Amino acid sequence: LGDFMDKRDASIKEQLSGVKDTSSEVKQLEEQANAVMRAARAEISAALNKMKKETQ
Amino acid sequence: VGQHFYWQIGGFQIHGQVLITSWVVIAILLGSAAIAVRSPQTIPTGGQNFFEYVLEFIRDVSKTQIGEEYRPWVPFIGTMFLFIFVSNWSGALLPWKIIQLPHGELAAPTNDINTTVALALLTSVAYFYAGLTKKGLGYFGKYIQPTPILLPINILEDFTKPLSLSFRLFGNILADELVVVVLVSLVPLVVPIPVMFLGLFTSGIQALIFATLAAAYIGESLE
Numbered sequence: 181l182g183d184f185m186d187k188r189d190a191s192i193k194e195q196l197s198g199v200k201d202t203s204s205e206v207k208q209l210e211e212q213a214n215a216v217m218r219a220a221r222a223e224i225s226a227a228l229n230k231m232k233k234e235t236q
Numbered sequence: 237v238g239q240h241f242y243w244q245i246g247g248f249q250i251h252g253q254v255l256i257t258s259w260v261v262i263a264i265l266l267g268s269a270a271i272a273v274r275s276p277q278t279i280p281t282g283g284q285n286f287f288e289y290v291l292e293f294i295r296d297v298s299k300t301q302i303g304e305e306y307r308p309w310v311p312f313i314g315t316m317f318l319f320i321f322v323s324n325w326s327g328a329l330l331p332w333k334i335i336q337l338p339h340g341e342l343a344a345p346t347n348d349i350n351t352t353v354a355l356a357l358l359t360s361v362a363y364f365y366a367g368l369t370k371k372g373l374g375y376f377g378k379y380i381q382p383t384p385i386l387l388p389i390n391i392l393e394d395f396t397k398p399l400s401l402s403f404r405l406f407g408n409i410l411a412d413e414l415v416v417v418v419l420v421s422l423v424p425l426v427v428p429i430p431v432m433f434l435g436l437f438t439s440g441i442q443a444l445i446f447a448t449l450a451a452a453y454i455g456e457s458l459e
Contacts, residue, residue, distance in 0.1 A: 181291075185291050
Protein backbone atom coordinates (compact mmCIF):
# COMPACT_ATOMS: atom_id res chain seq x y z
CA LEU A 181 0.00 0.00 0.00
CA GLY A 182 2.86 2.36 0.76
CA ASP A 183 4.29 1.72 -2.67
CA PHE A 184 0.86 2.26 -4.21
CA MET A 185 0.55 5.60 -2.41
CA ASP A 186 3.96 6.63 -3.61
CA LYS A 187 3.21 5.59 -7.15
CA ARG A 188 0.04 7.58 -7.29
CA ASP A 189 1.63 10.66 -5.76
CA ALA A 190 4.65 10.48 -8.06
CA SER A 191 2.45 9.99 -11.07
CA ILE A 192 0.60 13.12 -10.15
CA LYS A 193 3.70 15.14 -9.27
CA GLU A 194 5.37 14.00 -12.47
CA GLN A 195 2.33 15.06 -14.44
CA LEU A 196 2.54 18.49 -12.87
CA SER A 197 6.25 18.75 -13.64
CA GLY A 198 5.72 17.66 -17.23
CA VAL A 199 2.92 20.15 -17.54
CA LYS A 200 5.32 22.64 -16.07
CA ASP A 201 8.00 21.33 -18.42
CA THR A 202 5.72 21.66 -21.45
CA SER A 203 4.80 25.23 -20.57
CA SER A 204 8.45 26.27 -20.42
CA GLU A 205 9.14 24.47 -23.67
CA VAL A 206 6.30 26.37 -25.39
CA LYS A 207 7.55 29.68 -24.01
CA GLN A 208 10.98 28.90 -25.43
CA LEU A 209 9.42 27.96 -28.78
CA GLU A 210 7.55 31.24 -28.94
CA GLU A 211 10.63 33.25 -28.04
CA GLN A 212 12.72 31.50 -30.65
CA ALA A 213 10.08 32.06 -33.31
CA ASN A 214 9.87 35.74 -32.44
CA ALA A 215 13.63 36.12 -32.58
CA VAL A 216 13.80 34.35 -35.92
CA MET A 217 11.10 36.51 -37.48
CA ARG A 218 12.96 39.62 -36.39
CA ALA A 219 16.16 38.36 -38.01
CA ALA A 220 14.47 37.86 -41.37
CA ARG A 221 13.02 41.38 -41.45
CA ALA A 222 16.03 43.19 -40.00
CA GLU A 223 18.44 41.12 -42.07
CA ILE A 224 16.72 41.94 -45.37
CA SER A 225 16.42 45.63 -44.45
CA ALA A 226 20.14 45.81 -43.71
CA ALA A 227 20.91 43.98 -46.95
CA LEU A 228 18.93 46.43 -49.10
CA ASN A 229 20.47 49.41 -47.33
CA LYS A 230 23.97 48.12 -47.88
CA MET A 231 22.94 47.07 -51.36
CA LYS A 232 21.01 50.29 -51.88
CA LYS A 233 24.01 52.29 -50.77
CA GLU A 234 26.28 50.38 -53.12
CA THR A 235 23.93 50.94 -56.03
CA GLN A 236 23.73 54.64 -55.24
CA VAL B 237 -13.51 -8.19 37.66
CA GLY B 238 -10.75 -10.45 36.47
CA GLN B 239 -7.15 -9.97 35.41
CA HIS B 240 -6.75 -13.71 34.91
CA PHE B 241 -6.25 -15.36 31.52
CA TYR B 242 -5.70 -18.75 29.89
CA TRP B 243 -2.37 -20.07 28.68
CA GLN B 244 -1.66 -22.37 25.72
CA ILE B 245 1.32 -24.73 25.89
CA GLY B 246 4.17 -25.61 23.52
CA GLY B 247 6.25 -26.86 26.46
CA PHE B 248 5.92 -23.32 27.92
CA GLN B 249 2.70 -21.39 28.56
CA ILE B 250 1.63 -18.42 26.42
CA HIS B 251 -1.62 -16.46 26.78
CA GLY B 252 -4.34 -17.51 24.39
CA GLN B 253 -6.24 -14.24 24.40
CA VAL B 254 -3.39 -12.01 23.33
CA LEU B 255 -2.48 -14.22 20.39
CA ILE B 256 -6.09 -14.36 19.18
CA THR B 257 -6.66 -10.66 19.73
CA SER B 258 -3.48 -9.55 17.97
CA TRP B 259 -4.38 -11.96 15.17
CA VAL B 260 -7.61 -10.03 14.67
CA VAL B 261 -5.48 -6.86 14.63
CA ILE B 262 -3.11 -8.29 11.98
CA ALA B 263 -6.08 -9.44 9.91
CA ILE B 264 -7.92 -6.11 10.00
CA LEU B 265 -4.72 -4.23 9.15
CA LEU B 266 -3.63 -6.37 6.21
CA GLY B 267 -7.23 -6.70 5.05
CA SER B 268 -8.00 -3.01 4.73
CA ALA B 269 -4.48 -2.26 3.44
CA ALA B 270 -4.52 -4.86 0.66
CA ILE B 271 -7.97 -3.55 -0.19
CA ALA B 272 -6.61 -0.01 -0.51
CA VAL B 273 -3.53 -1.01 -2.49
CA ARG B 274 -4.96 -2.97 -5.43
CA SER B 275 -5.89 -0.25 -7.92
CA PRO B 276 -3.88 2.91 -7.35
CA GLN B 277 -4.92 5.99 -9.30
CA THR B 278 -3.06 9.25 -9.90
CA ILE B 279 -5.82 11.20 -8.23
CA PRO B 280 -6.72 9.73 -4.80
CA THR B 281 -9.95 7.80 -5.16
CA GLY B 282 -12.56 7.14 -2.51
CA GLY B 283 -11.12 5.37 0.50
CA GLN B 284 -7.48 5.51 -0.59
CA ASN B 285 -7.03 9.11 0.54
CA PHE B 286 -7.45 7.88 4.13
CA PHE B 287 -4.56 5.41 3.90
CA GLU B 288 -2.63 8.07 2.02
CA TYR B 289 -3.20 10.67 4.75
CA VAL B 290 -2.18 8.06 7.32
CA LEU B 291 1.10 7.58 5.49
CA GLU B 292 1.54 11.31 5.26
CA PHE B 293 1.03 11.64 9.01
CA ILE B 294 3.51 8.88 9.74
CA ARG B 295 6.06 10.45 7.45
CA ASP B 296 5.66 13.78 9.14
CA VAL B 297 6.09 12.43 12.64
CA SER B 298 9.13 10.37 11.76
CA LYS B 299 10.66 13.23 9.84
CA THR B 300 10.20 15.68 12.66
CA GLN B 301 11.52 13.24 15.22
CA ILE B 302 14.35 11.69 13.20
CA GLY B 303 15.36 14.24 10.57
CA GLU B 304 16.60 13.97 6.99
CA GLU B 305 16.87 10.15 7.19
CA TYR B 306 13.26 9.56 8.17
CA ARG B 307 12.43 7.46 5.10
CA PRO B 308 14.13 4.18 6.18
CA TRP B 309 12.28 4.01 9.52
CA VAL B 310 8.84 4.92 8.15
CA PRO B 311 7.53 1.30 8.13
CA PHE B 312 8.72 0.77 11.72
CA ILE B 313 7.17 3.90 13.24
CA GLY B 314 4.13 3.36 11.06
CA THR B 315 3.70 -0.09 12.53
CA MET B 316 4.19 1.26 16.07
CA PHE B 317 1.39 3.70 15.39
CA LEU B 318 -0.98 1.39 13.57
CA PHE B 319 -0.61 -1.74 15.68
CA ILE B 320 -1.09 0.17 18.94
CA PHE B 321 -3.92 2.36 17.59
CA VAL B 322 -5.79 -0.55 16.04
CA SER B 323 -5.09 -2.55 19.20
CA ASN B 324 -6.78 0.03 21.42
CA TRP B 325 -9.65 0.76 19.05
CA SER B 326 -10.30 -2.93 18.57
CA GLY B 327 -10.36 -3.37 22.33
CA ALA B 328 -12.77 -0.48 22.64
CA LEU B 329 -15.22 -0.91 19.79
CA LEU B 330 -15.23 -4.55 18.87
CA PRO B 331 -17.94 -6.19 21.03
CA TRP B 332 -16.15 -9.10 22.65
CA LYS B 333 -17.99 -9.66 25.90
CA ILE B 334 -20.48 -11.53 23.75
CA ILE B 335 -17.62 -13.91 22.99
CA GLN B 336 -16.89 -16.13 26.00
CA LEU B 337 -13.37 -17.53 26.26
CA PRO B 338 -12.55 -20.63 28.32
CA HIS B 339 -11.04 -18.49 31.09
CA GLY B 340 -10.70 -14.82 30.18
CA GLU B 341 -12.11 -11.67 28.66
CA LEU B 342 -10.77 -10.75 25.23
CA ALA B 343 -10.21 -7.01 24.87
CA ALA B 344 -6.88 -6.06 23.35
CA PRO B 345 -3.36 -7.26 22.50
CA THR B 346 -2.02 -4.49 24.73
CA ASN B 347 -4.00 -5.48 27.84
CA ASP B 348 -1.46 -8.14 28.66
CA ILE B 349 1.72 -6.23 29.34
CA ASN B 350 3.67 -8.76 27.34
CA THR B 351 2.63 -6.76 24.30
CA THR B 352 3.72 -3.51 25.94
CA VAL B 353 7.16 -4.66 27.02
CA ALA B 354 7.62 -6.43 23.68
CA LEU B 355 6.86 -3.22 21.79
CA ALA B 356 9.22 -1.40 24.15
CA LEU B 357 11.95 -3.92 23.47
CA LEU B 358 11.33 -3.44 19.77
CA THR B 359 11.82 0.30 20.07
CA SER B 360 14.88 -0.48 22.19
CA VAL B 361 16.30 -2.75 19.48
CA ALA B 362 15.40 -0.03 16.98
CA TYR B 363 17.29 2.80 18.65
CA PHE B 364 20.19 0.51 19.55
CA TYR B 365 20.30 -0.56 15.90
CA ALA B 366 20.26 3.02 14.70
CA GLY B 367 22.92 3.96 17.23
CA LEU B 368 25.23 1.04 16.51
CA THR B 369 24.58 1.42 12.80
CA LYS B 370 25.19 5.10 12.04
CA LYS B 371 27.62 5.83 14.86
CA GLY B 372 30.87 4.30 15.99
CA LEU B 373 30.65 0.72 17.17
CA GLY B 374 32.97 1.66 20.00
CA TYR B 375 30.37 4.06 21.41
CA PHE B 376 26.81 5.31 21.14
CA GLY B 377 24.74 7.85 23.08
CA LYS B 378 25.55 6.20 26.43
CA TYR B 379 29.16 7.43 26.66
CA ILE B 380 29.70 9.78 29.59
CA GLN B 381 31.06 12.41 27.22
CA PRO B 382 29.57 15.46 28.89
CA THR B 383 30.93 14.51 32.31
CA PRO B 384 32.58 11.30 33.55
CA ILE B 385 30.52 11.56 36.76
CA LEU B 386 27.34 11.74 34.72
CA LEU B 387 27.70 7.97 34.01
CA PRO B 388 25.44 6.63 36.75
CA ILE B 389 22.55 8.86 35.73
CA ASN B 390 23.16 8.04 32.09
CA ILE B 391 23.38 4.27 32.59
CA LEU B 392 20.15 4.42 34.59
CA GLU B 393 18.54 6.53 31.88
CA ASP B 394 18.90 3.77 29.31
CA PHE B 395 16.94 1.35 31.50
CA THR B 396 14.16 3.84 32.16
CA LYS B 397 13.21 4.72 28.58
CA PRO B 398 12.00 1.25 27.79
CA LEU B 399 10.32 0.82 31.15
CA SER B 400 8.39 4.09 31.07
CA LEU B 401 7.54 3.58 27.44
CA SER B 402 6.59 -0.02 28.18
CA PHE B 403 4.55 0.91 31.28
CA ARG B 404 2.65 3.98 30.17
CA LEU B 405 1.10 2.27 27.24
CA PHE B 406 0.33 -0.86 29.19
CA GLY B 407 -1.08 0.79 32.26
CA ASN B 408 -3.25 3.13 30.28
CA ILE B 409 -4.97 0.52 28.15
CA LEU B 410 -5.53 -1.71 31.15
CA ALA B 411 -6.79 1.13 33.32
CA ASP B 412 -9.30 2.18 30.71
CA GLU B 413 -10.65 -1.33 30.29
CA LEU B 414 -10.96 -1.80 34.04
CA VAL B 415 -13.08 1.32 34.37
CA VAL B 416 -15.43 0.03 31.71
CA VAL B 417 -15.60 -3.31 33.52
CA VAL B 418 -15.84 -1.89 37.06
CA LEU B 419 -18.47 0.58 35.92
CA VAL B 420 -20.55 -2.02 34.10
CA SER B 421 -21.14 -4.23 37.10
CA LEU B 422 -22.37 -1.22 39.07
CA VAL B 423 -24.56 -0.01 36.21
CA PRO B 424 -26.00 -0.93 32.75
CA LEU B 425 -24.36 0.18 29.47
CA VAL B 426 -26.04 3.60 29.08
CA VAL B 427 -24.23 5.42 31.96
CA PRO B 428 -20.60 4.45 30.92
CA ILE B 429 -20.62 5.78 27.34
CA PRO B 430 -19.01 9.13 28.18
CA VAL B 431 -16.24 7.34 30.07
CA MET B 432 -15.60 5.01 27.14
CA PHE B 433 -15.42 8.10 24.90
CA LEU B 434 -12.79 9.59 27.20
CA GLY B 435 -10.91 6.31 27.18
CA LEU B 436 -11.29 6.08 23.42
CA PHE B 437 -9.84 9.57 23.22
CA THR B 438 -6.79 8.46 25.13
CA SER B 439 -6.72 5.15 23.29
CA GLY B 440 -5.38 6.67 20.12
CA ILE B 441 -3.18 9.20 21.92
CA GLN B 442 -1.18 6.72 23.98
CA ALA B 443 -0.70 5.04 20.63
CA LEU B 444 0.44 8.23 18.91
CA ILE B 445 2.61 9.37 21.84
CA PHE B 446 4.33 5.97 21.77
CA ALA B 447 5.13 6.22 18.07
CA THR B 448 6.18 9.83 18.50
CA LEU B 449 8.33 9.08 21.49
CA ALA B 450 9.78 6.02 19.77
CA ALA B 451 10.81 8.13 16.81
CA ALA B 452 12.42 10.62 19.16
CA TYR B 453 14.69 8.00 20.67
CA ILE B 454 15.90 7.21 17.17
CA GLY B 455 16.95 10.84 16.94
CA GLU B 456 18.92 10.57 20.16
CA SER B 457 20.85 7.74 18.57
CA LEU B 458 21.68 9.50 15.33
CA GLU B 459 23.21 12.64 16.82
